Symmetry: C3
Subunit: 294 residues, 3 copies
């Protein structure tokens, strides 16, 4: 797009504040930012807040979200669709024009690990260019296994195609399939979807810990066979709802937009790859590392 030529908007921080016991304000941007998705390969991504996937949003079950989107794109409208909320798509997930803002209000009444994304037509084009992310809604009474959990991270899987190529987006195989991590607490890694960053800079843990991962496969098009090498998932909660509780899985299937909470123990020191077991995708980038030390 001619108007995006030489646009590179620096990342803006997620703005969030709680205004009531069950009411939260969140403010995000839609903006155009260059992301290195593979070594030497830039993608002029369509983003929320200059990150792809977008920044992590965490709320509590029963929170009402008062959402503001500032659209910094100089030419293309953008919108926001949270999978966590009950809303009217045609009133509450509407387009916000270039240089304008819109504020929408809706409740998050179910716990889980929900995808979020732009809902502007054509939706495939806006998702594939980078407008996705995850919102975690914490359960009111936790998970049954919370007391066993030593450590937590958030991982997202996504695909990259030929830049802004609608024929590729529809008919082509992915050029890259990648993981990213988003921070739950200051100090945790917060990265973009690329082929290399979680290889070079592994996630960390200690020998003997039980690790919880909140995972979502945002696609846009592929399913995921998610698996951690050298362990078995003790517990899995489909979509992060406590009630959907499976045990002893080797591999967790995730639909496009699907999430889960998975928990597992690392019994010995060394480096544990994290993959999607559809190994064409793992070869195209979707291998993250977990380094476990004494």
């Amino acid at each position: 797009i001619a108007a995006h030529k030489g646009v590179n908007q620096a990342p803006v921080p997620l703005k969030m504040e709680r205004v009531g016991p069950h009411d939260v304000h969140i403010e995000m941007t839609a903006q155009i930012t260059d992301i290195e998705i593979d070594k030497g390969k830039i993608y002029k991504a369509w983003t929320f807040n200059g990150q792809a996937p977008g920044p992590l949003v965490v709320v509590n079950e029963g929170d009402t979200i008062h959402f503001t989107l500032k659209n910094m794109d100089p030419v293309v409208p953008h919108s926001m669709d949270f999978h966590a909320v009950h809303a009217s798509p045609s009133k509450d997930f509407i387009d916000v024009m270039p240089n304008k803002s819109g504020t929408f209000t809706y409740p998050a009444n179910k716990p889980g690990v929900f995808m979020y994304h732009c809902g502007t037509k054509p939706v495939l084009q806006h998702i594939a260019n980078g407008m996705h992310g995850v919102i975690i809604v914490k359960p009111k009474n936790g998970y049954p296994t919370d007391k066993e959990v030593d450590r937590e991270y958030v991982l997202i899987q996504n695909e990259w195609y030929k830049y802004n190529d609608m024929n590729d987006f529809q008919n082509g195989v992915p050029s890259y399939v990648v993981f990213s991590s988003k921070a739950l607490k200051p100090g945790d890694p917060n990265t973009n979807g690329d082929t290399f960053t979680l290889k070079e800079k592994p996630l960390l843990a200690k020998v003997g810990e039980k690790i919880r991962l909140y995972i979502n496969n945002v696609g846009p098009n592929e399913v995921s066979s998610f698996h951690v090498v050298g362990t078995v998932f003790d517990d899995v909660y489909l979509d992060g709802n406590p009630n959907n509780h499976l045990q002893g899985m080797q591999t967790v299937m995730l639909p496009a937009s699907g999430g889960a909470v998975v928990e597992f123990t690392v019994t010995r020191p060394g480096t544990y790859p994290i993959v999607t077991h559809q190994f064409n995708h793992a070869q195209k980038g979707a291998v993250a590392m977990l380094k476990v030390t004494e």
Copy 2:
């Protein structure tokens, strides 16, 4: 096929009558009918009863089905395979020759939302050309959530390829992925698998209702990530068995031939898209609309 050139057999109504407390007679046709699958695009479909997917069949758990197939195809044999039944495939799912009829008897002893299809070799060719559909077997004691349900519809997802092109059917991407609705009660929409009809003529509901959808992804080749925009599924029953009960899903993965009962609430007026969240497929047609009014 030369013998199908200029064949367009008008749709015939499903014939069904109950002959006992647990015995039902059903009579269908195999026939060749032109279907508009996309605007300006005709597909000379291989069908049951001139519909693709085929007509909706609804029976009760424990019913024995006495099935008759009249094969109206002037050259190609056809057969019927119900996923709901216990049968001998090589005696009970046999081919019925052109201009002949066959009658088969078998019981439906499990509740659910089962795929049905032609079982003639090569099976891919007969399915891809349009010979699929759904049979619902109602549970003897219902679902736990029946009292909460205000309204019900049936949705099927299918793919269309290059007409009668075995290389495309095997190796190609779908040209179209579509939804159709089938009627539970006179007055409900009953449509074919096309890109447009549920966009132009949405399904209807009222603000505040709990909606049940009986869904099956007949393929033939793809999986589905089924999701309703602006809501979360309160309850899901995998394959429509009451015992396979998940809660709070954002998205339901369906294998090829897979079904589910899903239930959700619409809290605000407007138009709610219904998609498969593998968004290449949604772009190729698989977006249905639900219009919710005061």
Copy 3:
């Protein structure tokens, strides 16, 4: 590979002995063997023990496995990754050089139907060329339905691509998708992944039996929609863990590397096809037969 030109190493028998109440010794080979994957088509497979998929390994829950890999490949290193075990991938799933052996020890503490495979970079290349298989870990207290089960078999699904073609492995469709059976008890069929052997030589059962299948889809790349024609699965245990118990499924979705225990009844004599219901794959070979006699 020049050094594999005219290499055809004859199959070696799996070597297994129990050395303690909870300790087992297993010895396998990595070796290069010609497999007829389709009629008239040889694939110079990278194998464990001259079989593709590899030989069946069966242990008990809580067993510690003392594993030896003899690498008979004259040029390429190989390794072993068992999904059943808790291990350090970078110490315990390491490469064993040509003409050398390595011995590793790790526990199998969870019951199920686990994939196993070579873990040598690039992992896709080693899996796609044939280095996969299944290890069953029997539950300490069985499955709830053991008393109902009359008969058992093991089935694996895999893909074959263009020989040793990394571009095909990453970007291409499978050339073949196949089933194989592995023997639980001497006398049961033990076959390789090909298009024909379970068509010509069906699995056997008697009218009225409840049949248990232990299934795993090793991929490397595709998911499976597993379905037996003419029946409905009475019970399914995801990944073969007793706790993940679904009922009345028509079709079981399996991620890449995913497994399940499924059980079903055959009520009438004749031939029951076993398929993946993604029918492009079934057309490319993945149809097995079950013959049911009086």
